[PDB]
PDB file of C-alpha atoms and ligand atoms in Angstrom:
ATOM      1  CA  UNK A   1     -26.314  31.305  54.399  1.00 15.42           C
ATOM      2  CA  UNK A   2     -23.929  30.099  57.223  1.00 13.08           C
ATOM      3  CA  UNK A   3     -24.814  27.381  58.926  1.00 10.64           C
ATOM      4  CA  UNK A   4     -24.088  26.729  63.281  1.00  8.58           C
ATOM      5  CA  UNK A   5     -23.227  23.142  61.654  1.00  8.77           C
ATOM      6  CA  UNK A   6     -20.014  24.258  59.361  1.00  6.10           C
ATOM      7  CA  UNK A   7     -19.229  26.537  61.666  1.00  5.35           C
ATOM      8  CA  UNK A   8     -18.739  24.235  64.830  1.00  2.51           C
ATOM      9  CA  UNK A   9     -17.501  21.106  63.103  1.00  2.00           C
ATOM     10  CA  UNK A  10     -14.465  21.279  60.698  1.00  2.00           C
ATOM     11  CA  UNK A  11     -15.061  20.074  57.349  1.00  2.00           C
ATOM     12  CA  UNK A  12     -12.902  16.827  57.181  1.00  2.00           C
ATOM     13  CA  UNK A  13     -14.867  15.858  60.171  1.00  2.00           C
ATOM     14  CA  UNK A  14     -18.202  16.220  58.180  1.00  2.00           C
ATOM     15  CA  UNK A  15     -17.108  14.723  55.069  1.00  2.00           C
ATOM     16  CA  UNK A  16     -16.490  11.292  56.631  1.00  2.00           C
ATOM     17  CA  UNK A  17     -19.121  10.960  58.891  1.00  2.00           C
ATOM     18  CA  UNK A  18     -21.459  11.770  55.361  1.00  2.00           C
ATOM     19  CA  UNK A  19     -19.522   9.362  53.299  1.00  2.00           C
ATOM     20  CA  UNK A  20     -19.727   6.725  55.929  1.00  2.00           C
ATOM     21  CA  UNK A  21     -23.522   7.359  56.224  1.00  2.00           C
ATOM     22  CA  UNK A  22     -23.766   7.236  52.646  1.00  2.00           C
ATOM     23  CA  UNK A  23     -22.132   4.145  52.426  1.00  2.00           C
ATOM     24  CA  UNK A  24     -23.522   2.116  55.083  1.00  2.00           C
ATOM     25  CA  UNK A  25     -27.121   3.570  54.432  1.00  2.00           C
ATOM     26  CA  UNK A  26     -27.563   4.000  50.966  1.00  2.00           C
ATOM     27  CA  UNK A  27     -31.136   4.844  50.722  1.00  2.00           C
ATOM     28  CA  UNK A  28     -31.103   7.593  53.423  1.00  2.00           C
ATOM     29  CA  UNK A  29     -30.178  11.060  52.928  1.00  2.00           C
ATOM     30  CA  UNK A  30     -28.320  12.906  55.633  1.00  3.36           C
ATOM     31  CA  UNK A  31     -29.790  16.542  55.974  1.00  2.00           C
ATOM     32  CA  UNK A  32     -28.698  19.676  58.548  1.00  2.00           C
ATOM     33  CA  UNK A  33     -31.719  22.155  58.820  1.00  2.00           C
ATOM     34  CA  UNK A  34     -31.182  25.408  60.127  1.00  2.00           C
ATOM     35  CA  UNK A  35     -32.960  28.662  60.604  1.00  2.00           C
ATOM     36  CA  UNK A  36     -32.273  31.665  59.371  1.00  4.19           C
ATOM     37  CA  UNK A  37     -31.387  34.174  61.899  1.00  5.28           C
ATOM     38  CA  UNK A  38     -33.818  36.880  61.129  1.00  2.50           C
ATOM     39  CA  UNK A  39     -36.738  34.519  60.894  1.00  3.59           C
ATOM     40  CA  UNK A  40     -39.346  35.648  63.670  1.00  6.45           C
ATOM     41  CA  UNK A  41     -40.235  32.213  64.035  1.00  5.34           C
ATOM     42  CA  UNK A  42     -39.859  28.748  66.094  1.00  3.04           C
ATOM     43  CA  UNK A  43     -36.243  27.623  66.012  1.00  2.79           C
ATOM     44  CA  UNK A  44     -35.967  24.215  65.655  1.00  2.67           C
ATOM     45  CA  UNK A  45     -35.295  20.994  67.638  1.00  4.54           C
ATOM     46  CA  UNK A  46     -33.234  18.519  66.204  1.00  6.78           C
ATOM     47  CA  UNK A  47     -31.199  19.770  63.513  1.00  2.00           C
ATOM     48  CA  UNK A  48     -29.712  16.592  61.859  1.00  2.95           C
ATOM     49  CA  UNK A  49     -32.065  14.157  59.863  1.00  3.91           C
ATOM     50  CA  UNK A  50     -31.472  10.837  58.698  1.00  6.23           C
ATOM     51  CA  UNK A  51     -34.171  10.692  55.832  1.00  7.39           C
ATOM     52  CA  UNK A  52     -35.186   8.376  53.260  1.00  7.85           C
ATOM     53  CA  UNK A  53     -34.225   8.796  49.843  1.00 11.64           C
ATOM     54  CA  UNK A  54     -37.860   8.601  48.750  1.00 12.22           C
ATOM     55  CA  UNK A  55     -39.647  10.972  51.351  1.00 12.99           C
ATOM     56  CA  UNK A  56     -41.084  13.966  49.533  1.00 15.30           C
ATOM     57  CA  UNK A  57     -39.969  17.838  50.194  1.00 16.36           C
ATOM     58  CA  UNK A  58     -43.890  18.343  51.385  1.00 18.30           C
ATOM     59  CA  UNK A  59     -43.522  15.634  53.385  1.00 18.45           C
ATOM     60  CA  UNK A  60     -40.293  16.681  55.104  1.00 18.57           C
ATOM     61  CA  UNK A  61     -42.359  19.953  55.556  1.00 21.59           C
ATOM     62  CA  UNK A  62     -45.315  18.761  57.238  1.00 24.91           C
ATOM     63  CA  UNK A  63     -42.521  17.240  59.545  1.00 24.00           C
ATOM     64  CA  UNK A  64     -40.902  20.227  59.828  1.00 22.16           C
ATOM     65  CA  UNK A  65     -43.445  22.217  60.788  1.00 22.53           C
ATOM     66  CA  UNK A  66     -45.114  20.243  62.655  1.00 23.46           C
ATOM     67  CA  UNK A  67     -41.397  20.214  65.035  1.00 20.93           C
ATOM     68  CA  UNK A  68     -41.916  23.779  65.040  1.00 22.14           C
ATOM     69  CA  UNK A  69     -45.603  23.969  65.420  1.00 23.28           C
ATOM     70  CA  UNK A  70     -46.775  25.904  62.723  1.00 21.78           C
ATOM     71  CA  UNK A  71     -49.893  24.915  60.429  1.00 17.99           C
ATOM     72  CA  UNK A  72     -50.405  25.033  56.844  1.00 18.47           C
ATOM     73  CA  UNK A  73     -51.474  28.758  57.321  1.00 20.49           C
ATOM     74  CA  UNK A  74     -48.466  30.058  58.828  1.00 20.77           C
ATOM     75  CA  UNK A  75     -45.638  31.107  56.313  1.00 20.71           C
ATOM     76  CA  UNK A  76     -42.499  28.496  55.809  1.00 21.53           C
ATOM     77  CA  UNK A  77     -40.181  28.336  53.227  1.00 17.11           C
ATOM     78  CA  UNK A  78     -36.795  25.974  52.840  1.00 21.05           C
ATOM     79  CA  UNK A  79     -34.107  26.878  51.117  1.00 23.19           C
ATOM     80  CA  UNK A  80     -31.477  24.977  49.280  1.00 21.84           C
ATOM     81  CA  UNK A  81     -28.507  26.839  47.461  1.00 21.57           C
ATOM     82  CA  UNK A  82     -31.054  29.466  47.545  1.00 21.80           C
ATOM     83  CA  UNK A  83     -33.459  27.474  45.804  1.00 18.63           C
ATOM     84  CA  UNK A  84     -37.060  26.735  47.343  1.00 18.48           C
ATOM     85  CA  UNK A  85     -37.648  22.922  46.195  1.00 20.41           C
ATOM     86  CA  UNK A  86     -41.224  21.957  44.887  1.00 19.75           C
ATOM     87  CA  UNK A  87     -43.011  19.961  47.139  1.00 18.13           C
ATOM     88  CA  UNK A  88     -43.205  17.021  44.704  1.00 16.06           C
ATOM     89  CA  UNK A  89     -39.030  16.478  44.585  1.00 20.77           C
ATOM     90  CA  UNK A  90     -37.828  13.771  46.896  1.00 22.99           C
ATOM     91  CA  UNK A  91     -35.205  14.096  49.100  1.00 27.49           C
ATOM     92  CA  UNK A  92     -33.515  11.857  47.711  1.00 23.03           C
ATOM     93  CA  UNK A  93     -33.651  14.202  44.256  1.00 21.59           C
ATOM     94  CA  UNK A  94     -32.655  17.199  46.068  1.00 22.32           C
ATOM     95  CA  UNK A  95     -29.629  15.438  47.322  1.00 25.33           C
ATOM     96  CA  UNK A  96     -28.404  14.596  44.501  1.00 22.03           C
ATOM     97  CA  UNK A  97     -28.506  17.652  42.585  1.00 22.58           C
ATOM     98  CA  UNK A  98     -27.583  19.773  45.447  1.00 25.57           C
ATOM     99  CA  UNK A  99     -25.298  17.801  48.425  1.00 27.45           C
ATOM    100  CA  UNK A 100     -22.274  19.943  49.649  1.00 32.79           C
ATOM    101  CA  UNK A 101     -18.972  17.893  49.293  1.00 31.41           C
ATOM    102  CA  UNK A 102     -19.256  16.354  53.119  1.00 30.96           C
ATOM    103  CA  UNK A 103     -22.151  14.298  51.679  1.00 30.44           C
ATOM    104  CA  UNK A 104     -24.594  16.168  53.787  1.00 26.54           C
ATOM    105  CA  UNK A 105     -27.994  18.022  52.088  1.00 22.89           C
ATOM    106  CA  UNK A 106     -28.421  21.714  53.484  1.00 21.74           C
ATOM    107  CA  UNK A 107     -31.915  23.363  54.575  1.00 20.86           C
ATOM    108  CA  UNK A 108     -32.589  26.511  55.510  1.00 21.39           C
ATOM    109  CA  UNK A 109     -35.852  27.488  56.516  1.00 19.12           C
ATOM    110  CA  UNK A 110     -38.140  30.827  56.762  1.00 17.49           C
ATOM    111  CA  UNK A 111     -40.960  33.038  56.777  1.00 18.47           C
ATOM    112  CA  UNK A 112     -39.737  35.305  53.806  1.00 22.24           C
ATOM    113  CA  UNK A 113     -39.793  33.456  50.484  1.00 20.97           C
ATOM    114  CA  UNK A 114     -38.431  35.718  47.406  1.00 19.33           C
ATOM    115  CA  UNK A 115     -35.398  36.434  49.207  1.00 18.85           C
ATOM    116  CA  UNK A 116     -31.816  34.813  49.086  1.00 17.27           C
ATOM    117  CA  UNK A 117     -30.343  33.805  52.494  1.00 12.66           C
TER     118      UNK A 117
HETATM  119 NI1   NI B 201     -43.930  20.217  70.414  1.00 15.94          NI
END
């Protein structure tokens, strides 16, 4: 998917503010969450997250939704690289397999679940 992030802030620009958090912060994980456009659902907040390394993907979710007030029963679904990451993967896993090359982890988030975004 596109993200409002890329799209507003040139690349060399996001590359060394990740490598400087990176360096300075080494046991955080620097994330930009986005919807996707055709969700039907709450759009979110705060879109940059400094998290730690060893928060889990269900526990970035219950933050999540709870931003966006929606409970366990309404549908949610991130998306990384088109992947949806298990709940038990930290972030700090799901960085490291899957950062873009300005250091920075990318969510997307929405109600559909089989589809690519
Ligand atoms: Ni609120």
């Amino acid at each position: 998917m596109k993200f409002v992030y890329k799209e507003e802030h040139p690349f060399e620009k996001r590359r060394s503010e990740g490598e400087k958090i990176r360096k300075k912060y080494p046991d955080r994980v620097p994330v930009i969450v986005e919807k996707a456009p055709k969700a039907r659902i709450g759009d979110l907040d705060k879109k940059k997250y400094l998290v730690p390394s060893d928060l889990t993907v269900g526990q970035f979710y219950f933050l999540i939704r709870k931003r966006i007030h929606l409970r366990a029963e309404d549908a949610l679904f991130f998306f990384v690289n088109n992947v949806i990451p298990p709940t038990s993967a930290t972030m700090g896993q799901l960085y490291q397999e899957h950062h873009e090359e300005d250091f920075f982890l990318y969510i997307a988030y929405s109600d559909e679940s089989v589809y690519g975004l």
